[PDB]
Structures are given as C-alpha cells and as structure tokens.
C-alpha cells in the first residue's frame, strides 16, 4: 500500500452542523487525527500519515499559508508517495493553482474538501476524502500538475473553479474539462494540461516569507474608482480586474489602472465572465498601456499568477509571456 | 405590422472593425438610422423608429443612461407597441434588469446585442437584432418582464447573465433557464420569471435624478481590506461583497463591511460564484450582522437592486424581504 | 402539524421492502406522516405499460386519502415514468418521483437525503399545481423536461431546454418557474378505464443504419413509432423510406431527435405534413413515445396528433 | 508562405459543388492556398460505409500531396464519421471537419467564418498528432469525444466528457489539451484494402422497450449490435433476452447508453463477462458502433474487442 501524507488546513470537511438537516456549519474544527479516522477504509488504500497545519475556513485562506504548503510539500516530497490536502471549498482553486505554480515534486498532490458537514444527511466528505486518496495512491496522477478531486471527477488545479454555490458537484474545469472520472475505485485518465506546471516552473517561494501584494477591483456600470485607488496608495505591486465582457474596464477605473502602469504598478485585466479567455487583440491595446491580459485565467486564478511573476520581473512583456505559458 | 421603438445605446452591435477577420472592435459607431438601415429584414415584420439614446461601449453604463432609459421607455410606452434597446454586451444584463425593476409598462422591452461587429465574417448582429424585434413584436411576450434575446433565446433580464468572453452563444439564464426559443421566427414560450417585475415593483425612477451609491467589493485569498474602506470613507449607502463560495467573506473584509452596517450602511452579501444562491442559515448569520442575503443575484445584479431598495429604505429587514421578492 | 404523505416504491438502487425505507430515513418524522406502499420491487430498466397504469389509477383513487405522494424509483426510465403521470394525473396535490445514483451502503449514499428533499417538496403547499415533479441533487424539476444527463453522477437529472422550476435549501423552496405546457388535469387523457396502451416503438437513425428495426415494427402492426433521428430529427434514407410507407398504411410516426438539446421543430429538412409525420418538438424519443401512446388514445389522425405534441 | 490545404467535400447545410463554396469564400486565401475535391454532395443524415472508406483511403493515399485536410459535412453525423476518420486515418497531417448549422442564405449564416476557422486550423503546424478533429463555433473538438448536443444552436457542438483542446481567437489557437486515447497512425484499424465494413446495428432501450428491433438485426446476422441503453447502459429485460442470446450464438454486443455524457462502465448491474458483452465506456452508441465496426475487421472474440475499447 502506497505512503500518503494528509496535511489538513480545514473547511466544512473538518467540520459539524448540530444536526443531520442542519445547513448552518463549522469550519476548521475538527483535528487530522480524527478526520482521517472517521474514514476507516482509507486504510484499504494507503498508510495515512495526517499533519496539521492550520485549522481555518478557507475563506480566510491567505499568503502565510500557502508559502507553509508548499515548502512542507517540498521539503517531505522524498518521504512519501503522495499528499493529499484536506481544505475548505471556497478558495481551494486559488490554493490548488498556487501550489500547482511552487510545488516541485512530481508525485501526485491531491486538494479535496466537501459542501457538506460529516454530520448532515448524505455528506459528502467520507467518500470525497476516499476518492482524494484513491487519486494520490495512482501511479497514473503523477506529472499532471496539483489536482483537485471532487464528485467523482479528477480536475487540473488550472482549470478548476467552484461554478455552484451549494451543489456537492460544483467543482468542474470549465474551460478544458477534468482530467479523468473515478468508478469502482479506478481512473480513466484521457487528459492532462499542456500549460507548464510544478517542476516545470521558475517559480521558487522555498526562502520567501512573503508574497507580492496583489489585489483584485471588480468592474461594473457606473464603477467607483475608489477600490482601484486605494490599491495604488497603498503601493500594491500588482492590481488584477476583474472586468466586463472580454476584460473590458470601466471608463474611471481604466483611467486609474492606466496611471498605475505608468508608474510601473503590474495591471492584468481578468474578467468577471466565468468562462473564456481575456483575449489580447480586442477592444484593449495592452502593449500601448502596459498592462497583460490574462487568458482563461478567472481574478483569482490572475493574482496567483501574477503574485509568482513579481517574483521574478516587473516587466509587463515579460509578465505576459509568464501569462502565455503557465 | 407592429410599431417598435428601438432605443440605441452603443455597443459592438453598432460598431465596426477594419477587415471581416480583425477581432479588434470599435463600440458606438454607428448611428441608430444606420444601424437599423442594415438589416432591410426589419421591415417585413415591424414598423421601425429609431432613437439614438448615447453611443458607448457598455463597458462604460452608467447611472445616468438608466435613468434616461426608463424614463423614455415609461413616457413613451402608450404611443409604441414594443421597445428593442440595442447595447454593448459587457453590462446588458446589468441595464437589462435595472429596466426589468424600474419599467412600468407592460408592453415588451427587449434588449440586443452583438459579439462581432457587422463588419466581421458571419457577424450575429443582423439576425440578433432581427430576432429582437420578432420578440418585441409578439403578443406572447408582453407581461414577462424586461428580456434580452440572444443567441435565438429568449431570456429573463432578472437571471440571464454573460457566460463567456467571446462566444457567440454566451448569454444563459444559468439557474432557471430560458423563456422560450426562436425558430422561423416564432417563439415557443415556455416559462416566465416568477419573481415580480416591471409593474409589479415599487420602484420609481421617474423624478430621480441620482441613484444610491452602491459600489462591490471582491472576496479571495489574502484579500486586502482597503476597497470596502475607501468606500465605506466615501459614505457609500450600500456595499454588496463578490463573496466566495455561499457568500463568504475574507476576515478582514468581514471586519469592515461589519462595522459599515452597525452605522447604517447597507451591505448585501453575493458571491464571486456564478451559479446558484447566497442562501440565508449557512455560516454567515445575516440578522446578527444586519446583512442582506442576494440569493441568485450575482454581484452586478445584487448592486442594481440595492440601489433601487435604497431608494424605499435603509432598514436590512426591510431590504431582505425586498431581496426575497424581486 | 406535519402533512400525510404517501410514498409508493417502484424499486430501484434507491431501495428491499417500503417499510426498511422509510424506517432507514427516521428524520421523515421531522416533516410528514409518511405511509408505505410496495406497487412494485423492479429496477426501470425493466418498468412499463402496466406499472404506469397502475401507478396513475392510484394516485388518482387515493388523492382524497393523503396531502401527497412521493414515488421511489429506479433512475434508469424515471425521465418516462414522471412524464406519463405529468400527463394522466388528476389529483391537484404534489407527486414527487425520487431515485438514488448510489447504493444505500456506500459512503455518502444520495438516497436517504434525496428521500428528505423529496418529502420536503411533497408537503411544500407551493409545490401544488405545478406538474408531477421530480426531486434529486437539491432541485425540483418538472416531469416535463426533466432528463438524467449522466450515466453515474449524482447531480445527473437536469431540465436541459427549459431548467428547474426550484431549488432546495434547509428544507425550503424557493419556487420561481412552473411549466407552461398543460399538465395533470389539464389534459384530456383519462387511463381510470384503460388496461393497455397502445404499441409504440423507437428506432435509431445513425450513418448508415438499418431499416430492419423499423420494419420489424411495422410487420408488427406497432401503433407508433418514434424516430430518434439525426440532428434536428432527419432520418437515414432507408429508414425515412420505411416510415413514410408506415405513416401512408395509418402508422403514427412522430420525429424525435438523439440530440440530447433542443426542438425536433417544424419547417426545416423534413416536410411533415407531406409524409403525415409529426414534430416532437423538445420531446426526447423516450418522452414522445409517452405522448404518442397517450395520442393515440384520443386519435389516430396525424394532424390532430401534432396538435397534441404542440399543446402537451 | 501560405500552407497548401485540400478541401474534401461531403454536402450539409455548409453547402451545391466544391468550387462555388471555395469561391465563396474568399478570405479562405489570405491563410491557404486551398483545393477543392468533390468526394460526394449528400446531407449527412444519410452518411455511410462506403462514404468512410473513400475518405479514409483518398485522405491516406493523397496524404503527400498536401499540407492539411479540411472535410465539408453534415452537421447531422459529423461526430460518426470524425471518429472513423480518427481511428482510420494514417497521414499524421491535420484532418479537420466542419458543418453549418444555418443556410448559406439567411442571416447571420455560420458557415463562412466556420470554413476560414477550419482552414486556419488545419493550416496550424501545432494541430498535427492530435487525431481527427472538428472545429465549430471558434473551438477545436476532438474526433473522438466530439457530439452534437442541440438540434438547432450554432454552439452544437460540444466534446461533452473531457472538454475542447483548444479555443480560436484571432486566427489562432492555444491548445491546452491532446486526447490520450490512441488515434491514427496508433490504431490497428487498416481499410485499405477494405471494401466493405461489418454490420452493426442499433438498438434503443426504453420502458416497455420491444425485442423486434434486436431479433430482426439477429435474424439479419449482423455482426455486432450496439444497445443504447438506459442510465449505465441498462437493458429493458425483453431487449437483455435477445442480446444475452445472440452474444452467445456470436454476435458482439456493445452496451453503451443513450444517457448524453459519461462512461457506461464496467462492474455496475450487469456482469459483462459472464454474457460476453462489451462496455462501450464514454462512446455514445453511434460512436460505439464505429468503434466496433472496426474491432470486427480484427477479431470477433469479446474479451479482445473489450480491450478494443479499453484503448481506442
Ligand atoms: N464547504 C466549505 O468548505 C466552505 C467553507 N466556507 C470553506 O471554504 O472552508
Ligand atoms: N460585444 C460588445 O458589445 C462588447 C462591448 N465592449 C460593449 O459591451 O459595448
Ligand atoms: N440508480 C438506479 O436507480 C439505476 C437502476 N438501474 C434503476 O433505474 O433502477
Ligand atoms: N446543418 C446540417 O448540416 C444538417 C444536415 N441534415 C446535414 O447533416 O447535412
């Protein structure tokens, strides 16, 4: 039976409601030790070893834990088979494409979580947490890049995004598919994603204790400049906008970002539309303001993309190509 | 024939590009005269007056065109028998459902547009725009709200929202559906919105001048506190949060928008997810914080509909059973 | 307080007796009075004529004994069975089909919240006048539209043209669409005196397929048959060939679509009124047999047939 | 500069002879430089055996000659005879198909635009070894998880289970995906000297399904019967009979589902390996039987013909 290391960080898997109907929940409660013991056939499958790492609804999910992630997974990558990450819904395709971008181990990393409590009526967690597993203990998941497993369905750590806010199956890869679906156990795997991941990148946080500061300005009629400003006064080194359409700006925040690009702030236009590429070569001349367009990458997908790249350069040329190949 | 206004305001449907295979568009263009010139088709099934209203990219809609817009569509409801509006794509469904709240006439208002310029090879915005009018001309439609209508789809302008960046195919009414499909230029309707609508709101723009000031704030990973700040220290009268998952909030963001709604500011919670609910009786207790749940409204959505209910109170009871309803 | 809800078990991975059910699920007891009966123990991949018919006829002979009726069933043909009663019902209070994508004994099983939710739905006051439902991953779907979209996902069942009419949350609904089309008392069909149906049959169109299925239908003397044709209902040539000599000797043929989206419509490749043919709009193969057999109760006229797949 | 593209001509909406279409558009020049071959002028609902092999052949013989295939279709079977064409096809050169939904005529017609995206494709360099493909509404599909998913919408097209491998802007690509499963020069599949195909008929499951159907293609000694069967590819019992036997006089059955996406599996209800049937996995019963319309031309043992489509 394969190694398999579990590093929990919480979410409603680790959670309780205060019955089995409940739809109010706790995050972050319950410890690794005994989340892993509520699921006894895992021991079918591998020897679990389960750390701690923090114990936290993932909408609180920030920096300090993600420089923690991946320089944990770096550091025992010798000395186990695979991991599997246990983690709250919510930002765990932020997480899961931050890991994809640092983690330099070739063996399978695995991100699960659940919409439901183990204690409501049909969870989902206890078989979630089994499918996660059954995915770390296949040979066939290793050199895919950090994997999100969820309803049944192997997705890339890219691609994926929570497209439902309350449906056990709101995981989906929106753009390119999953990677593979598991029955009986077993995977199919007829995918993997062709944009450079894990070893494959330049991006090293192994001696950082601190990331750039990236914010996130959403765009709508009649937009307030306002969010985009404070960034910029707050000296943030990269802004993402989430924009209209085909990453479109409002008129008063494109003025804003405009100005912070000159000045050598990094500016990605993103989009709010939650299919599709932020496409160069459509209504923004991005080499004429000095901003990058962030292809099917969503707002927060952009930031953790962009927050790597400012580890490296400030250049907006050189930033769109990391943007055309990770 | 029937009498249709149509009311222009901008957009790629009336815009251009120098060659039928450049992705590169120009937005409002082309006058409405024009606009309407190029598709003779028109003719055979409507009695066509054109009104220029602006000519802007709907990257740039603003509070003072949908005022403008319902004002004209209410004055002028008794002399017409329908009205088409055609209008960049980025925020339709942003106008599409401040008319459907603030129109009064029962008479069909159809919004249209295009995601090609005419000049474009195998351009939508003659058959878009066709398919517009046939809506607006049929007696079925009338009593179903505000529509947009895309893609030979009739669509709510309550649910219906932009999908995708660039596909032709972007607009879906991605949690309850369309009304109805257009073939040989009739429609099968098969649904309409249940949620009250047009006459049946108590919303009245006629003698504003100024709408509420309700900006949005984006929820992620590490994310920064300073844009719910600067709006709060604006005297913003709402703020609606792009939640993650079931309208969840980072911590620090939480602890601003907390603090705003003890003083009286309106915060409504929705979420960055684009389908399903930010329900009620998860982890977030509303009544505690004197927050506003959005259900299905996305975030753009949310902040229409907010700046409406805060033009009848500024009580969060009060807001949430108007929340509940339209 | 609570309502008295009726559960009849056809079978299905959801199922084993009614009453182990029911009594596996104790927080029913939350919500309804719920009482048992076993009508059949099969899987759908084997249901039929007989156990529509008899499901309708009690339904409609128990509707003054009960606040509603919750149907267990096997996944397989509940998109058919939800249909037909959405056509034949008569009782005005909900009737709620409900399945199970994994076994009772797997981890995190669907059936026994699946069964709340669906109990949920038949005691919601609101869910009344809206069609004979069915309730699976936390949406109410009408009978009408309703499709399983996947062969293994729980989130299978999905309204493709049309979308759900409600979604689920802490036990509460919130409604905001009803089928438009007619339903339940508003047909005229009426199975009280009926015990068949008529025969109707569906054949496959695909590249270069055969007309023998066709065929062994009509030497059959099928009353029906139904296409499930190639993009917007076309036919093969050899099987367009053997349907239009059916429809001429008195045949019903309706033209349906493989296409899993989107109308079978009117006015495209095929010239139905020419061939006595009948559009079956967004009705899916399996879905047009239900109205064509129910059709052909009233009718046997094509004309008056493709009335009735354009009102129901 | 320009790459030399051969258009091979079929028929559907799209199209009325190959030079017109061409000349139509002419946009088509600024990317290619474009021959145009009329191979047949039919719509595609009446597609065939022989039509396959004379692409195949023609495309694998003239495979020196040209830089890139583009293949003018039906929308209506597009996805059967891309799948072939996959699985047949040995120059290692992009194959692309496209169709239209609208008439050339009407407004807003699809097709121009779809033929320049098509070109644009084939004429890609970093399209080559990633099968058979077909590009609609400004997206690369590949031949194998290709469907058509709505009767009528120009975005029909759709690669339901595993997504598109790539998205056009601009006139060009970012491929993000290649299909792992093997295809064209990996493929034992050989019809050069192939004539004919074997004979696999297909079988629609359904409440209350008839036997006819299965008896008649059993009667006719087809080789192999393809069941689209209900849920994960489930048999109405009258239907297993028949198939159950003839599997054992000798005919190949496949079991795949009429169910739109996802996998009819192995090791649900029904014990393939005890009746000798075959799980079609996520082929969809047309794409079922091109697959094993060619496993038929190397073997007619069912536990090979499995492995078959285990790896193809
Ligand atoms: N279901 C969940 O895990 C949601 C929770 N708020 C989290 O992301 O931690
Ligand atoms: N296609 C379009 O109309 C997009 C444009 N930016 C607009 O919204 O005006
Ligand atoms: N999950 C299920 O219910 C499938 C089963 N074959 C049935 O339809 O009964
Ligand atoms: N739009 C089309 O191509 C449909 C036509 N029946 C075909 O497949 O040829």
Redesign the interface.
């Known amino acids: 039976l394969p190694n398999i290391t579990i590093l929990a960080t919480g979410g409603v898997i680790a959670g309780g409601g205060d019955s ?6 706790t ?1 972050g409660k319950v410890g690794v030790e005994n989340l892993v013991n509520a ?1 006894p ?1 895992l021991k079918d499958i591998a020897n679990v070893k389960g750390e701690q790492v923090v114990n936290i ?7 300090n834990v ?1 420089l923690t992630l991946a320089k944990k997974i770096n550091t025992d990558c010798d000395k186990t088979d695979g991991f599997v990450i246990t983690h ?4 765990m395709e ?2 899961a494409y931050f890991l994809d971008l640092t983690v330099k181990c070739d063996k399978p990393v695995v991100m699960v979580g659940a919409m439901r409590p183990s204690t ?9 947490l ?1 499918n996660a597993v059954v995915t770390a203990a296949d040979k066939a998941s290793a050199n895919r890049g950090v994997l999100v497993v969820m ?2 369905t192997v997705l890339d750590g890219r ?1 994926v995004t ?9 995981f989906k ?1 929106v ?4 990677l593979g ?1 598991i ?2 156990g077993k995977i ?8 450079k991941h894990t070893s494959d990148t330049p991006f090293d946080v192994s001696k950082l204790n601190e990331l750039p ?1 990236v ?10 400049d ?2 985009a ?3 910029v ?2 000296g ?1 080194d990269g802004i993402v906008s ?10 008063s925040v494109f003025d804003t970002l405009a100005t912070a690009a000159k000045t050598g702030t990094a500016v990605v236009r993103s ?13 923004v ?1 991005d080499a004429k303001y000095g901003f990058v367009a962030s ?1 099917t990458l969503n ?2 997908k952009a ?1 953790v993309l962009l927050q790597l790249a400012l580890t490296q350069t400030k250049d907006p040329q050189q930033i769109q190509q990391i943007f055309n190949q990770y």
Chains 1, 2 share one sequence.
């Open positions: 089995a109907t409940k739809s109010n929940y995050v699921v056939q609804g993932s909408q609180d999910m920030n920096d993600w709250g819904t919510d930002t932020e997480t409501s009526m049909s969870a989902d967690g206890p078989f979630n089994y309803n049944d691609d929570k497209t439902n806010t309350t449906d056990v199956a709101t890869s753009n390119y598919g999953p679906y029955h009986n199919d795997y007829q995918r993997t994603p062709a944009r500061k914010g996130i300005v959403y765009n709508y009629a009649n937009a307030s306002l969010p400003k404070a960034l006064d707050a943030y989430a924009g209209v359409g085909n990453g479109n700006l409002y008129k989009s709010r539309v939650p299919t599709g590429a932020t496409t160069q070569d459509a209504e001349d292809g707002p927060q930031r």
